[PDB]
Amino acid sequence: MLKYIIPTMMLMPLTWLSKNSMIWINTTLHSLLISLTSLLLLNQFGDNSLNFSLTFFSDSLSTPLLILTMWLLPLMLMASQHHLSKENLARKKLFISMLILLQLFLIMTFTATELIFFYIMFEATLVPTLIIITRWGNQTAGLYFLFYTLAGSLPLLVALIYIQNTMGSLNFLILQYWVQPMPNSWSNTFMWLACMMAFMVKMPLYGLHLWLPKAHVEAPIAGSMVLAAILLKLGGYGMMRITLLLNPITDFMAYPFIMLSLWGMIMTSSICLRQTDLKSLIAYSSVSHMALVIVAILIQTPWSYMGATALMIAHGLTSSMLFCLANSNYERVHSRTMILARGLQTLLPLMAAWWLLASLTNLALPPSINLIGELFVVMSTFSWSNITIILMGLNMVITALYSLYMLITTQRGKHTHHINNILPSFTRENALMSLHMLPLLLLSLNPKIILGPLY
């Protein structure tokens, strides 16, 4: 993985030594070169993972997450250069450096062979994200960080150090072969919660989800793209690595949290039918889609893991495109109110076509990989219990509705009279929409690369 980390770090002199007008073009060009380089991670085999060194390895789970992570950086640089054109040049380079450092943390979070190195990179990703949201966010306690680190990261730290002292190693490749059955006790119960709850908050879990529809609203566009596209999937990646050690206790301890997700994807979806903020609607949709990833990881069948990694990749693409569409409207009406600007197909036909495609992939229109992930998760949960299909299907009613209501509220009807600064679609914005949607459509032609270690 050293052939990807070193160009990522050479993007730091490539963004600081460049000229005063060249720090978007150079960074976009060379990050697209690294994203083209990222396809060599697809050297995968049906038995053995692509094990590079003692520190780095990349199986078919981390590989689509890595390709999406290295693809997300040029798209964030295309997204965030408009509203930073009035920003200072040194703070502009600071923003690009925070994005490059966050990519640097992510690409060796996903390829950490050893679990405490995964933990350090996992909790190192939060610092550039928090700098981006607090500094280049728009509006104005802080108790969410404290409640996160009490129930989350340090129980995970003590848990991984305990596994280190018991097993002798936190190598995932060794723990594939030295995994022991974890019996019913109270020590193993709090051990299981200490291993799981940090990723539970990072998904988010329903009831622990309220940090996200505010962190998306207080973010810039690149912060929202990297939150909903990659950083929410660190929880799913960590769960798919940590549920190896946590058997067979999960077979009776997944019962509460699955409830919180199986009802949660009912509630938050319905919350998406009662939103006034477009960006909060996309945020609660992200919660409702990650609930199925939580369910599919906790029931731990092969069809569920295939559906969950397909849903992670497809939801990263779809939610990033929806946040970029919300950015394109926020950079015209200067207000995130969804009922404010209406009828925008009468003015911007191609942008309304991108809205149509994004809403079709949001409600899992087949043969998209959204529907492939959604469908495989529904198959595995029907195998889990034959009643959950109702709770699936009711969800698949509501996930249509707010996907099209958001399409009907903003893009249809009579246009707003007192808004006359609706410019035509810039070429950068439609380029951003097409670089979100055309990979998402092309993966429908060959989905087996985004179906995880056990296709």
């Binding site: 060194s53 003692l54 520190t55 062979t113 050893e114 405490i116 190195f117 280190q164 936190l170």
Partner: protein, 57 residues
């Protein structure tokens, strides 16, 4: 016929030839504990570095 000793004579360390044996353990000291073993052998490098969670050197 006794000569009085001079200045310096009575404070001399003399030698005495006794027929009695030397006391081989005048302190009645019991057997000492055997000491801890010393180090021997050449110093090879550490097997795969520090072995501190993931650091390979």
């Amino acid at each position: 016929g006794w000569v009085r000793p001079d200045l310096g004579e009575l404070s001399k360390v003399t030698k005495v030839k006794t027929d009695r044996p030397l006391p081989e353990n005048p302190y009645h000291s019991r057997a000492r504990p055997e000491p801890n073993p010393e180090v021997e052998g050449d110093l090879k490098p550490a097997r795969h570095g520090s072995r501190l969670f993931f650091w390979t050197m």
